[PDB]
Design a protein around this ligand. Sequence first.
Ligand SMILES: CO[C@H]1O[C@H](CO)[C@@H](O)[C@H](O)[C@H]1O
Ligand SMILES: CO[C@H]1O[C@H](CO)[C@@H](O)[C@H](O)[C@H]1O
Ligand SMILES: [Ca+2]
Ligand SMILES: [Ca+2]
Ligand SMILES: [Mn+2]
Ligand SMILES: [Mn+2]
Lengths: 241, 241
Amino acid sequence: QDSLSFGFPTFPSDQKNLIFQGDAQIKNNAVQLTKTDSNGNPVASTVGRILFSAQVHLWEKSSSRVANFQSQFSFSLKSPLSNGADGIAFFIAPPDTTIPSGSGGGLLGLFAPGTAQNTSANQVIAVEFDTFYAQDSNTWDPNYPHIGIDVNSIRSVKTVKWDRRDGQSLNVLVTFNPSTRNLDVVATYSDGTRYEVSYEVDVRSVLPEWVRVGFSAASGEQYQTHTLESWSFTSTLLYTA
Amino acid sequence: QDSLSFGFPTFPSDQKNLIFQGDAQIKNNAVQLTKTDSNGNPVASTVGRILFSAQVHLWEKSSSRVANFQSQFSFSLKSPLSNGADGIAFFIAPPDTTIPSGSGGGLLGLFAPGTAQNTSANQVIAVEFDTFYAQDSNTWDPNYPHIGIDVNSIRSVKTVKWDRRDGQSLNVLVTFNPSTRNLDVVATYSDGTRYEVSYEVDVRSVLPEWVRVGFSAASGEQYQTHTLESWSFTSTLLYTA
Ligand SMILES: CO[C@H]1O[C@H](CO)[C@@H](O)[C@H](O)[C@H]1O
Ligand SMILES: CO[C@H]1O[C@H](CO)[C@@H](O)[C@H](O)[C@H]1O
Ligand SMILES: [Ca+2]
Ligand SMILES: [Ca+2]
Ligand SMILES: [Mn+2]
Ligand SMILES: [Mn+2]
């Protein structure tokens, strides 16, 4: 299809169009990307992801069209500690994507250790909400919590200082305009605190014509829950000047 | 997802979200449901169907909600014969639906011979555009080309006279309003000729909560092409009093 749209106001237990990978599962109307114990508390060493089953036609060579898309979602992070890790990411990748070996902790379940910073070795675009930046393990991170745009590398091409708020839902709007090629990210807490980051990227040179979209999260030594509460997505192929 | 929509202004041969059954396949940016030879001429004894891969949440028991959906599509039929057969149908059925054995010809690839008219043995809602009505073989049909609403039986719960126009596209809008429980059908030819038929049906008593939507077509001894030219669909779960 030229256009596709779907919306999950909440996540009821009986899902049919979601691909669950790793430790991801539905709990209390929300998707728990990372594993939690019987009490509902976060645990260490866990990676989980979800993808919508239907493939998205991001661009079409024959017609020279590129899709304009928008992904709106909200999530919350909770941890008994104060150094919650490692973060959650909205991502777009080839349809057959699977959790790379050794992609836990700071790699957010998106990159393999040996090629995490090799751009010509990856095919992924992600918007990360990174809460752990210890310079000894996450050497590629700025020294502070941040929202970043990742293009084929765990080392963001652009980041913005961000504030982690335990238990508070962050509302996010990610949009891609094929006309200007700008991928814009706007995130806000209920009190109006806003964060914005954007980057110009030609999706045609990074991803194949058909892709799958979803979320990924992980916790290494440090942990926190990564709760996806809602998600709506829409894409439409358009002709650019 | 509570809501889902997709649009196929045309059908490029590079499809990823369509399930093809039988002889259905993409030809010249359109779906040819029934088999055609090298020159694109229709042949006898062929059945074909397509379904969108993502399952649609028609209704939800736990929340007492039922979906409001709309399906807009256009097709054309062509045959050198004076009695082209057998017809095309938009249908809704359980996710695992496959072409029943012996469902060819007048059964439109939708029903099995043994239970074609047994309502307690089927789970399908379809809007048929039936061009073959020979009273000796299609004993259940009125004696003329017609549009029919089928609920668990090849013997339509309702039909209205329809005119078959060789090689002319028919635009159809099928809608279901959960409030009134009305399934409305409106079809038109490019010259303004209009056909309308409506039927009240509680989809909850006929179909499971999750279903797949698509098209089916067949030709027995008499034949014609059944070309799906475009299709858009949208559904949203709504609270029903
Ligand atoms: C000590 O390092 C480990 O734990 C941290 C914090 O969870 C992760 O960032 C890192 O990738 C993992 O290897
Ligand atoms: C002569 O009968 C055969 O051909 C007609 C026309 O195609 C079909 O309607 C029927 O099901 C099939 O058995
Ligand atoms: Ca990090
Ligand atoms: Ca018939
Ligand atoms: Mn980072
Ligand atoms: Mn009929």
